[PDB]
Design a protein around this ligand. Structure first.
Ligand SMILES: C[n+]1cn([C@@H]2O[C@H](COP(=O)(O)OP(=O)(O)O)[C@@H](O)[C@H]2O)c2nc(N)[nH]c(=O)c21
Ligand SMILES: C[n+]1cn([C@@H]2O[C@H](COP(=O)(O)O)[C@@H](O)[C@H]2O)c2nc(N)[nH]c(=O)c21
Lengths: 288, 287
């Protein structure tokens, strides 16, 4: 009934998520990670509490709505506490997560700052080509249009174990090379984009029995690697990644191109960067 | 204080989630919805608890060890929201349902969605209360009182105001009759900009949070049909901030600048519940 160490000095919040009601703490002892997570409610305990006189403090009241701070008895307050002692530097590194900042990249900013900065790094996407010519992961191919210009390869995301449909996640990687991102799309890629959208959906209906209206289909701007690929996710599955600051629906990307051929070269795209990403600093410096 | 009703007979669990530790309850008291949500942690006060004497209880063990922790009163705050009297619309709104996506064309909005929308929607009495100062007046963060281009920025109902990690404010325009994104024309640009700029700058004044820490957007299919803009901490993955729901204000403004008839002509994408009559009406029109 005690911690495996004496005393706890907070050195750094490695990561928090108010959505999941969780925190990851790094504290020195006497190196150790503590993790605190609020628990699910039990229906009967809450219902029992609400027939009575719960300890409440009013936050506000408007018409039929009202909110409060409730301070319930012991039974509902359980915090799942996961300690990690000792902690190597590799444990502290895998929990660390950087604050994100928003950036609004005009078309000119892309050509002058982002693109040059990207060309100065040499992101190897050799792994992608190995999938495309089946040197790697051929067993995982769900569907393929083999057309070198307008085709693609559909594969399940590495983390989706495939044992349920709640969290269905696939990605489509285009066969054609040199499409770095959203920024390179023009009406020329419309047939490719249409193939991914409608053949991708038809593929998933066949393999997994999931209708098209159960699919969020999108690209990421700022993607993690620079060779066009599209995400197909179950709609019921909510993660960061389908957020508006990063996800662009393929269907809408296609319609933008049909209405406005130069949309993705001329228009301003909004995305988030880690606060320590040199690109963030370079875009800021150029915008003031 | 006390709840605005007495008793509570659980009729049904509308929605229950282990992921984000929240429960939505339909009770008789006359209907009421009572929402209970576990709260984010306060950093300086967890560090205090751990260094003193925690109340622990071993469960699993190995370097991985697991416990049940029962903290003192301060860390146990549960965000409690009551709708009372709840209407039939409230009961369906919060009920766990299978969601389907729909791509609503400009014509689908005029012939199907809007006429359905004009039949009925949730009362907007709370919005009129904020604007007329009969409720929540002492929580106003910034008001531009211009009838047409003005708004009131106020803490969202969802936010318990205890930490910044889940900062959440809404800007509600003073001008009536702007039901949603689909009514926005270039004449609304000065308003939308006022919300973007004056809204962000007010957040900078009050909370010291820069605008690049902020996600600022509208919901399409909003639950309440009187234009209002959401302001959340970027680091907060807020429900309703997914691409199938949220439209960045700065992007809406620029859409309007490039193409004046954008939100009347273009196809929007949103999710509807399976028990939503709108979904069936739209699906019949598209088959
Ligand atoms: C009844 N009511 C609803 N809200 C908020 O206003 C927003 C309405 O936003 P919406 O875009 O119409 O969709 P949503 O209900 O699924 O989020 C919500 O985020 C609520 O948290 C409210 N916010 C305040 N401050 N006061 C209220 O009385 C009130
Ligand atoms: C090296 N690699 C990266 N990815 C995907 O690309 C994204 C970025 O990966 P990183 O964590 O290496 O930046 C992830 O979502 C992965 O799903 C990869 N996906 C597959 N299927 N196979 C690979 O070997 C591979």
């Amino acid at each position: 009934v005690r911690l495996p160490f004496s005393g706890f000095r907070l050195q750094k919040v490695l990561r928090e998520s108010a959505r999941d009601k969780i925190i990851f703490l790094h504290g020195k002892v006497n190196d150790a990670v503590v993790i605190l997570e609020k628990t699910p409610f039990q229906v009967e305990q809450v219902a029992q509490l609400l027939t009575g006189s719960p300890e409440l403090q009013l936050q506000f009241s408007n018409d039929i709505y009202s909110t409060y701070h409730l301070f319930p008895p012991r039974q509902l307050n359980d915090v799942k506490t996961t300690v990690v002692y000792p902690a190597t530097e590799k444990h502290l590194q895998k929990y660390l997560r950087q604050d994100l900042r928003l950036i609004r990249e005009t078309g000119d900013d892309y050509r002058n700052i982002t693109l040059p900065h990207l060309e100065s790094q040499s992101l190897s996407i050799q792994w992608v080509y190995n999938i495309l010519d089946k040197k790697a992961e051929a067993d995982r191919i769900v569907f393929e249009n083999p057309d070198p210009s307008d085709g693609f390869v559909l594969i399940p995301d590495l983390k989706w174990n495939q044992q349920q449909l709640d969290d269905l996640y696939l990605i489509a990687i285009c066969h054609r090379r040199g499409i770095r991102s959203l920024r390179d799309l023009t009406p020329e890629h419309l047939p490719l984009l249409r193939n991914i959208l409608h053949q991708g959906q038809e593929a998933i209906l066949q393999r997994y029995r999931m209708k098209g209206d159960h699919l969020r289909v999108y690209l990421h701007y700022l993607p993690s690697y620079y060779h066009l690929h599209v995400h197909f996710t179950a709609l019921g599955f909510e993660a960061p990644g389908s957020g508006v600051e990063r996800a662009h629906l393929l269907a809408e990307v296609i319609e933008n191109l049909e209405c406005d051929p130069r949309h993705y070269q001329q228009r301003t795209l909004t995305f988030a960067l880690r606060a320590d990403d040199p690109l963030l600093k370079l875009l800021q410096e150029a915008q003031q």
